[PDB]
Write an enzyme that holds these catalytic residues in place. Structure first.
Site, PDB file in Angstrom:
ATOM      1  N   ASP A 198       5.014  31.917  -2.617  1.00 41.09           N
ATOM      2  CA  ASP A 198       5.545  32.049  -1.273  1.00 41.09           C
ATOM      3  C   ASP A 198       4.852  33.229  -0.609  1.00 41.09           C
ATOM      4  O   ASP A 198       4.966  34.348  -1.106  1.00 41.09           O
ATOM      5  CB  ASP A 198       7.068  32.284  -1.318  1.00 41.09           C
ATOM      6  CG  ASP A 198       7.653  32.618   0.055  1.00 41.09           C
ATOM      7  OD1 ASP A 198       7.064  32.168   1.063  1.00 41.09           O
ATOM      8  OD2 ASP A 198       8.690  33.337   0.134  1.00 41.09           O
ATOM      9  N   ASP A 242       1.988   7.863  -2.923  1.00 43.98           N
ATOM     10  CA  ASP A 242       3.179   7.388  -2.225  1.00 43.98           C
ATOM     11  C   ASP A 242       4.029   6.468  -3.059  1.00 43.98           C
ATOM     12  O   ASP A 242       3.581   5.360  -3.301  1.00 43.98           O
ATOM     13  CB  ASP A 242       2.701   6.639  -0.977  1.00 43.98           C
ATOM     14  CG  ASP A 242       3.831   6.015  -0.179  1.00 43.98           C
ATOM     15  OD1 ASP A 242       4.953   6.524  -0.277  1.00 43.98           O
ATOM     16  OD2 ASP A 242       3.588   4.955   0.513  1.00 43.98           O
TER      17      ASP A 242
HETATM   18  C1  LIG Z   1       3.677  -1.112  -1.449  1.00 41.70           C
HETATM   19  C2  LIG Z   1       3.892  -0.151  -0.255  1.00 41.70           C
HETATM   20  C3  LIG Z   1       5.058   0.777  -0.640  1.00 41.70           C
HETATM   21  C4  LIG Z   1       4.739   1.595  -1.913  1.00 41.70           C
HETATM   22  O1  LIG Z   1       3.838   2.457  -1.861  1.00 41.70           O
HETATM   23  N1  LIG Z   1       5.447   1.480  -3.060  1.00 41.70           N
HETATM   24  C5  LIG Z   1       6.382   0.594  -3.381  1.00 41.70           C
HETATM   25  O2  LIG Z   1       6.837  -0.314  -2.668  1.00 41.70           O
HETATM   26  O3  LIG Z   1       6.842   0.788  -4.647  1.00 41.70           O
HETATM   27  C6  LIG Z   1       6.437   2.135  -5.033  1.00 41.70           C
HETATM   28  C7  LIG Z   1       6.262   2.161  -6.528  1.00 41.70           C
HETATM   29  C8  LIG Z   1       6.208   3.359  -7.279  1.00 41.70           C
HETATM   30  C9  LIG Z   1       6.066   3.413  -8.655  1.00 41.70           C
HETATM   31  C10 LIG Z   1       5.936   2.209  -9.321  1.00 41.70           C
HETATM   32  C11 LIG Z   1       5.974   1.024  -8.589  1.00 41.70           C
HETATM   33  C12 LIG Z   1       6.171   0.956  -7.210  1.00 41.70           C
HETATM   34  C13 LIG Z   1       5.141   2.296  -4.234  1.00 41.70           C
HETATM   35  C14 LIG Z   1       3.880   1.745  -4.931  1.00 41.70           C
HETATM   36  C15 LIG Z   1       5.540   1.753   0.459  1.00 41.70           C
HETATM   37  O4  LIG Z   1       4.513   2.090   1.389  1.00 41.70           O
HETATM   38  C16 LIG Z   1       5.026   2.089   2.725  1.00 41.70           C
HETATM   39  C17 LIG Z   1       4.381   0.875   3.456  1.00 41.70           C
HETATM   40  C18 LIG Z   1       2.846   0.834   3.389  1.00 41.70           C
HETATM   41  C19 LIG Z   1       4.599   3.376   3.420  1.00 41.70           C
HETATM   42  C20 LIG Z   1       5.154   3.629   4.826  1.00 41.70           C
HETATM   43  C21 LIG Z   1       5.433   5.177   4.950  1.00 41.70           C
HETATM   44  C22 LIG Z   1       5.171   5.679   3.509  1.00 41.70           C
HETATM   45  C23 LIG Z   1       6.377   6.547   3.082  1.00 41.70           C
HETATM   46  C24 LIG Z   1       7.702   5.788   2.935  1.00 41.70           C
HETATM   47  C25 LIG Z   1       3.851   6.521   3.369  1.00 41.70           C
HETATM   48  C26 LIG Z   1       3.708   7.786   4.219  1.00 41.70           C
HETATM   49  O5  LIG Z   1       2.628   5.741   3.529  1.00 41.70           O
HETATM   50  O6  LIG Z   1       5.052   4.498   2.633  1.00 41.70           O
HETATM   51  C27 LIG Z   1       6.585   1.971   2.589  1.00 41.70           C
HETATM   52  C28 LIG Z   1       6.707   1.158   1.300  1.00 41.70           C
HETATM   53  C29 LIG Z   1       8.178   1.259   0.685  1.00 41.70           C
END
Ligand SMILES: CC[C@@H](C(=O)N1C(=O)O[C@@H](c2ccccc2)[C@H]1C)[C@H]1O[C@](CC)([C@H]2CC[C@](CC)([C@H](C)O)O2)C[C@@H]1C
Ligand SMILES: CC[C@@H](C(=O)N1C(=O)O[C@@H](c2ccccc2)[C@H]1C)[C@@H](O)[C@@H](C)C[C@@]1(CC)O[C@@H]1CC[C@@]1(CC)O[C@@H]1C
Ligand code: NA
Length: 281
Positions: free
Chosen positions: A39, A171
């Site tokens: 920090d 993500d």
């Molecule tokens: C497959 C896509 C999605 C995704 O990554 N995931 C998901 O489903 O399951 C997660 C996941 C994690 C670990 C194991 C298996 C699955 C991850 C891969 C997410 O990605 C989105 C849509 C593109 C974006 C939109 C805004 C943001 C944050 C919420 C980020 C800043 O981009 O995520 C929302 C959507 C729930």
């Protein structure tokens, strides 16, 4: 087995409560013996309870008060992010000589629930202690908001112009790192096709010439994300009766890192199952 998301959220808020109670020992007991504190960003870590005590005691003497916002989890079994406002002065300063700073704290909790690491993001432009200019901090906070705007406008080509060809993104935190603009294009294309809307709340900068963070409230079509979230323990609500009408809401914090050319080369999104909701219908 790692602490539940709701327990990590409790530990982050408990830190604020114990600081607020003026309890030095109580605060220290929340940390692992060899815990690390950074920090602000872009300083040497403070390491271990002796060092942490030396760092916190002056703030406790200055009647530091921390007003927490909403905590966010992650899917890594360890992370939690907590925006807060922190007010403090020299011991016995009146409100007149107390400054106020907006921060976002990132905590990593161990298997036993004790804090192993704390990194505190805040910039001069987030603090009433100074009116000195810091155009770089402002630029990075703007870039964090601009990401959301371009997603919302369905402007994938525009979004990619903010980003480095070397972009690494994750993500949610606790999944895997994706690399490169074509991967980001696919991710963004899926977002747009799912009617993702990203409404930004608060921003802070880091004092390391690199980071910024934005809180975001997102919605999107229940399909296709919802069933995938459900399968990976990221959506623990019952399935909607009509998945074609339902929306998913996610509250998250997006942290960005910006390179030597002003392009985003690092992006992470902090959310977990406790940050996911269902808008049905
Ligand atoms: C497959 C896509 C999605 C995704 O990554 N995931 C998901 O489903 O399951 C997660 C996941 C994690 C670990 C194991 C298996 C699955 C991850 C891969 C997410 O990605 C989105 C849509 C593109 C974006 C939109 C805004 C943001 C944050 C919420 C980020 C800043 O981009 O995520 C929302 C959507 C729930
Ligand atoms: C502006 C910063 C700074 C400040 O006023 N000078 C404070 O940091 C100090 C006085 C207190 C501190 C760190 C020792 O407690 C905050 C951290 C808050 C939090 C969020 C709840 O990041 C953790 C998770
Ligand atoms: Na300032």
């Amino acid at each position: 087995h790692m602490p539940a998301e709701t327990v990590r959220k409790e530990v982050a808020l408990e830190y604020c409560r114990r600081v607020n109670a003026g309890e030095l020992e109580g605060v220290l007991q929340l940390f692992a013996p060899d815990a690390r504190l950074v920090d602000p960003l872009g300083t040497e870590p403070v390491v271990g309870r002796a060092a942490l005590a030396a760092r916190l005691a002056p703030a406790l003497r200055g009647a530091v008060h921390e007003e927490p916002g909403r905590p966010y989890a992650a899917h890594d079994g360890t992370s939690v992010v907590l925006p807060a406002t922190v007010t403090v002065g020299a011991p016995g300063a009146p409100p007149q000589r107390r400054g106020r700073t907006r921060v976002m704290g990132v905590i990593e909790v161990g298997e036993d629930g004790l804090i192993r690491e704390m990194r505190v993001m805040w910039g001069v432009t987030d603090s009433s202690w100074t009116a000195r200019p810091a155009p770089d901090e402002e630029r990075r906070k703007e870039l964090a908001r601009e990401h959301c705007l371009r997603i919302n406008d369905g402007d994938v080509d525009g979004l990619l112009k903010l980003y480095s060809p070397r972009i690494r993104f994750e993500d949610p935190v606790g999944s895997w790192t994706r690399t490169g603009l074509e991967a980001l294009r696919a991710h963004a294309t899926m977002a747009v096709g799912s009617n993702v809307r990203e409404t930004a709340g608060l921003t802070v900068a880091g004092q390391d010439g690199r980071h910024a963070a934005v809180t975001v409230s997102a919605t999107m079509d229940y399909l296709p994300s919802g069933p995938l979230l459900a399968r990976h323990h990221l959506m623990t609500l019952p399935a909607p009766a009509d998945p074609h009408r339902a929306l998913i809401g996610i509250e998250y914090v997006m942290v960005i890192g910006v390179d030597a050319d002003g392009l985003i080369d690092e992006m992470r999104a902090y959310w977990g199952a406790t940050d996911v909701s269902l808008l049905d219908p």
